[PDB]
Structure formats: structure tokens, C-alpha cells
Symmetry: C3
Subunit: 294 residues, 3 copies
């Protein structure tokens, strides 16, 4: 794309504010931003807000979202599909033209860990170039195990392919498969999907803690076999719905776009790798680290 040559739009902060007991405003951008996905490898990503995956959104069950997308891409239209919401896709997930904005309103009635992504045709191209992310909807009555949790983080898995190559997107193996972490509280790391950041700067915890991870595999194409080395998941809630409760799982399978809330205890000091156990993907980048100290 000639109009993207030389373009590197600086990241713009997510804007969110509550406007009523059950209403929240969210404003995002669509923008073109260089991201280092592996050491020495820059991908000129199509992004929300200059992050890939995009910024974390958190709302409460029952919130209506008033969402605005400002399209900063000079030539390509973009859109937004939140898996959390009930909406008419042909009226509410529609394209915003370059240099324009669009506003859409829809309710988030269901708790869980949902994917969001651009919905512009061809959707594979927009997702693969980086237009994906997670929205968490907090359950009204929490999770049954809330009282046991000592620390929590968000992890997202995605793939990267050859740059803007539709043949590779459709028919090729991923070049990289990566984790990123998105901040829930001040001080938490907030990273892009790359092969190295969560190895060099591990997530942190204390010996004996029960950790909760909110996880989602945004794809675009692969399923995930999510596993924390050195522990077993005490509790798993599929898609983050409190009713979908499994216990004692070694590994949690996630479809493309699938999410979960997983909880586990770290019993001894050391560094605990976090992987997809499809080890071709782990070898291509999908290993994060959790450093546990006394």
C-alpha cells in the first residue's frame, strides 16, 4: 500500500469514561504503527490505538457501550466487532472511512473474556495485520473463587504472518506466535504481541500465591493449548463465564477467539514458563515467563 509507505502513527491512549450506572463511553482509533514483533523484525501493523493486540477494555455485566472509532488510516476503511455485545452486524459493526469517525451503541449482557477485532472485509486481512484485542466483562456476582485469588494478569495469544500477504494468511504456517500482557491495575505491564518482551521482563508473583489469568487466543487461524509449566489449573471458567467451571486441568484448549479465566497456585520460588503446548508455536515465540519470588 503506497499510502502506508513511511507511515508510523504514534500510539494514542484509549479513552473510556462511565456516563451512567450502566453506560460507558469508549473511544478508539484505527491507525498504522510499526511494532517490533521479533528481535530486528518490524511489522507495520494495522492497529487499534497503536497497540497489537489493542488496548484492554473492561466493563461490567449489563453495561451499554457507546463506542466511537476514529479512523486515522489514510486509505483503508476499518470497523469494530466486540464479541461481548449483542448487535446487528450490518448496522453496528460497519466501516468507518479514512479520516472519519463513527459511533455505535450496544449492550454487554454476558460476563467473560471476549475477543474484539476489526470487521472490515476481508476480515482475515484486518485481523492478521493486527486489528484484534480483548474486552473483559466482569460478572455481577463475581466468580466463586474470588476470595482465593491473590494476583491477576491478562494474557493474549496471536500469530504474525508475512507482511500483508493474503496468500500466506490463508495458506501458510505462522511466522511467529506470541503472547502479550495488558494492564489491569497501575504498575502492570502493557505489551504488544512479540516473541521476547515477556521472557526478558517476566510477570511477577510471590511464593504461595493463587494467580488468576484472563486469557484469550485471538488467532487469526490457530487454536491454543494453554499451559503453565510447574502447576495445574485449580479452576477454569470457559469463556470466563462463572457457570462453565472445570477443575484440575493441566492444559486448556482455546478455539480461535476463545477465552478463559484460569487460576493456579505457585508453590516454590523460581521462573515458570507459560506456553501454548503446541510446541511448534511455542518455538516460534509463544512462551512467556512468570517470576515467583519469596
Amino acid at each position: 500500500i503506497a499510502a502506508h509507505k513511511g507511515v508510523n502513527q504514534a500510539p494514542v491512549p484509549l479513552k473510556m469514561e462511565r456516563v451512567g450506572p450502566h453506560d460507558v463511553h469508549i473511544e478508539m482509533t484505527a491507525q498504522i504503527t510499526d511494532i517490533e514483533i521479533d528481535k530486528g523484525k518490524i511489522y507495520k501493523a494495522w492497529t487499534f490505538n497503536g497497540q497489537a493486540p489493542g488496548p484492554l477494555v473492561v466493563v461490567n455485566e449489563g453495561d451499554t457501550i457507546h463506542f466511537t472509532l476514529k479512523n486515522m488510516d489514510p486509505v483503508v476503511p476499518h470497523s469494530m466487532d466486540f464479541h461481548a455485545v449483542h448487535a446487528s452486524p450490518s448496522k453496528d459493526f460497519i466501516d468507518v472511512m479514512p479520516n472519519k469517525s463513527g459511533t455505535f451503541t450496544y449492550p454487554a449482557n454476558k460476563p467473560g473474556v471476549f475477543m474484539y477485532h476489526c470487521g472490515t472485509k476481508p476480515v482475515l486481512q484486518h485481523i492478521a495485520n493486527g486489528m484484534h484485542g480483548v474486552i473483559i466483562v466482569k460478572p455481577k456476582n463475581g466468580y466463586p473463587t474470588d476470595k482465593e485469588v491473590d494476583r491477576e494478569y491478562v494474557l493474549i495469544q496471536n500469530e504474525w504472518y508475512k507482511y500483508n500477504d493474503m496468500n500466506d494468511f490463508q495458506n501458510g504456517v505462522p511466522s511467529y506466535v506470541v503472547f502479550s500482557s495488558k494492564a489491569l491495575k497501575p504498575g502492570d505491564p502493557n505489551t504488544n504481541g512479540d516473541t521476547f518482551t515477556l521472557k526478558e521482563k517476566p510477570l511477577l508473583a510471590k511464593v504461595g500465591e493463587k494467580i488468576r489469568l484472563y486469557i484469550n487466543n485471538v488467532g487469526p487461524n490457530e487454536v491454543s493449548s494453554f499451559h503453565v509449566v510447574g502447576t495445574v489449573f485449580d479452576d477454569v471458567y470457559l469463556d470466563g463465564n462463572p457457570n462453565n467451571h472445570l477443575q484440575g486441568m493441566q492444559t486448556v484448549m482455546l478455539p480461535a477467539s476463545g477465552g478463559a479465566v484460569v487460576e493456579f497456585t505457585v508453590t516454590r520460588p523460581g521462573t515458570y514458563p507459560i506456553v501454548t503446548h503446541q510446541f511448534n508455536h511455542a518455538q516460534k515465540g509463544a512462551v512467556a515467563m512468570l517470576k515467583v519470588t519469596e
Copy 2:
């Protein structure tokens, strides 16, 4: 196959009749039939009854099936394996020679949404060429959410490869991944697995309705990440067994041959895409449409 050159056997209707309170007769054919799997692309499919996937079969829990296969293929033997039944594979799923018939009897004791397919060696070749389908076994006591359902449809996902190419079947990516719909009531569409029919002629519903889909991924090779754009699944029954109940899932993972009953509400008028969220497969055809009107 020289004996298949020029062969295009017209579709034959499925024959079924109840012969007792718990006994049903089913008669199918194995036949060679040209199917348009993508615009301008004809596949000379190996089929049951001239449809790929084959015709829908529906029985009640506890029915014994008296099944006859008439093999119209001039050279290749064919057989039938129903996942619904308890049977001896080496006596009951055996080959029927060209121009012959065979009759087999076995019970369907378990409710759900089951794959059926030809069981002739090499099974990969017979499935990939089109010999797959779905049998639904209705639960004796229904599903707990029956009273909420306003409309229902059946969807099946399958792949297509290079024509009768065993190397591609074993080692290659699918050329197309497709949905088809099979009729439950008069007026419902009944389609083959192709990239376009359910886009051009969407399934129909009314605003506010709760929709039930009976779904199965027949493969042969891929898993599915089933998702309806613009909604969340209120209830999911894995393999269609009423006990395997999940709630509030954004996306339902299906193994190869796996089925489910999923239910969701459409809240606003518009067109709702239905996808596998493995977007390489969606790009290669696996998008259907649901048109919701006021």
C-alpha cells in the same frame, strides 16, 4: 478413475419410514454426482444420495435403525458408519459392492448431533470426496431450554481438497472450507457444501427470536471455532447431549466429527454472519449468513 469419466448421477431422495414405536427404516444410495463447490468449480463428488454433505437423518432416542445402502458407483465399494449407533464395525459397517445393496441394523441409544460417513478404506479418501453427513437423535425428554426456542436450523461444516488427490488430502491445506444447511421442516433450505449459497440466500429469522442451531464439523481434517457474529451463545449442549451444558460462550470449539446444539438471541434487524473463527477457513468459504427482519 476412468469409470467415473462423464458420470453424473441425478440425486435420489432419501427414503425413511417408521415401522414400529422404536424402529425406523432408512434407505440411501452411494452415487457419483457433480457439485458446484465454488463459483465455476465443479467437484465430481462421491456422495450419499447426490448431496455432499448427505441428506439429514432424524430419529428418536431409542430407535433401532434398519439401514439399506444401494451402491450406484460403477467401480468403487462404499459403506456407512453412523456415529449415533452401537454396532460391530467389522460386521455392520462393511462394504457394499458396485450395483449391490446391503442392509444393516443397529440401535441409536444416545441423543445428540452425530456425524455419519462412508467407512471404506482408505476412509480419508471417501470422506474427503464427499461421503459425510449428519444424523440427529432427539432426546426423549428434550432439552431444558426447548420452551425458549423460536426457530431452528441445521448447519454442517466440511472441507474440499484437490480432486481425489490423496497426497493433498493427507498433507495439504484445504482449498475450500464450507457450510451447508439441511432441512428440518418444509420450507427450510437444503444445500450442499459450497462457498456461496448461504451468502446469497441467507437463513431467515425474526427480530427478538431465540435461534437453535444443530451443528457438526465433519472435517475430514480440521477443527472448527464456531461463532455467530453479533451474538453470544446463551446455551450450548456439547454433542447435543442435554447433560453437557455450557452457558454464555462466544465461540464453540468442535473436533473433527464433533457436534453441538447452540442457542442464541438475535436482538436487532440486519444480517448476521456465521463463521468458523479460524479465519483462513472463513476466507476460503466458511461464512454463512442469517438475515433477521422485523
Copy 3:
């Protein structure tokens, strides 16, 4: 690897003994051993104890494992990661150098069917070359269906690639996908992952029996769609945890490293194939047989 040329170390028996009501000693080797993975095809595997997958380990819920690895490989370091245990990976899953031994201690608190494997970097290389296996942890209170089970076996699925070829391990399709069986009681077969042994020498059962299979898909890379032809799973316990109970499943999806306990009835005499229903993998070897006699 020049130091592996001509090396074929004879299999060494697993050593295990109980040393207290809740403590068990286990001693394994890491060794280089030629295995016939397909007719006429020898793979010089990296193994535990000269088997690939490695020997079966069975312990009770709540046992602490005192594990010793003796590394017989002349040049490559090796290690052990048990998915069953809570451990510090950076202190307890560490490398043992050639011709040395290491001892590690950790508890197995959770019931189920867990993968074990070498944890030496790059882990993909060590798993793909054969360093994988299963440990079963028996639940304190059993499974709710124990009284119904007449016979039980263990099955493991794995892949084989081009010999020690990291590009193929990361980017290629498997050359073979295979089942193996590991003995639970005297007289049970104990086999390696190959394309033929469980076809030529099927597992055995009697008409009318309820069979339990302990299953795990060790990968390294693929997910599994586990199915027994001619039956339906009466009960399924995901990861072998008694709480994760599904009923009436035709096919059980397993992530890479995922396990299950599955139970089904064989109603008629004959031979029942056992497959992954991803039929490209079945065609490449992943079909076992169960012979049922009167």
C-alpha cells in the same frame, strides 16, 4: 549428531518403589534408542528408558515423587517435566548433563492423566525426537463410574517428523501420527508409537464389557479428535479429573498435552477401530484396533 552415530542403547526397565504412605521413588534414564515407527522406517529416538512414548508411571493422589534421571546420552543434556506436579521449573525441571544423574522431589496433588516430557531447550526438539510420556494420578475417591468398568487400557497419541529436523518440527506436517499402549496390569501390551503394532495385535475385550481408556495426546504439535468406531462414550472425565464429567460424547477433543478418561460399551463381537477423526492423521498411522470376542 556425530556422537549418536551407531548408538542404540538397549531399553532399561523403569524403577519405582513406594517408600512411605505418601512417598514414591521413580528412577528413569534418558537414552538413545532405535525405534521402528513405520514398516521399514527406523527413528533413532531420544527416549526415556528406551521407549517412545516413555514408560507409564502410576501414583496415588497426594504422593510426593522422588524422581531420579540418569542421562545416558553421550552429548545432549536432558531433563524431566511432569505435568502432574507442583514444582519450580527453574529449580526442579533442570538439565542433567551427559553421564550424570539428578534427583528432584515434588508432590502430585491432583488426580488425572498427565503428560510428562523432557524440558531441555529447545523443548520442541526434545519432545519431537521422542521424550514424552504419561503419568496417571489415581483419585483418592475414584471415579463415580468405577463399579461399571470391566476392563481398562492406556493409549497415547504422538507425531513423528523428519529425523531431528528443526525446520520440519516447526513448519512441516507430521510424517506419521501414531498410537501406543502402555501396560497397567500384567499381560497388557506395552508398545511404542508406531503405525502398525496395534493394528496387527489389537487390544482385547469381551462382548458387553464397559471399557475405560486413559488417553493423552502428547503432540508435540497437533490436537486430537479421539473416537472409537461403533460406540459412543458413555462418560468422559476431562484431564481425568472426576469433576470434569461429560456424557454421551461421540468424539473427545484433546489439546496438545491434553488427557482424558473415557468409558464406552462394546455391544457386539468384532473389531472396533480407534482413531483420531482428523483423518489426515489417521491415514498417516493413527488407527488402533480393539478386538471384541464372545
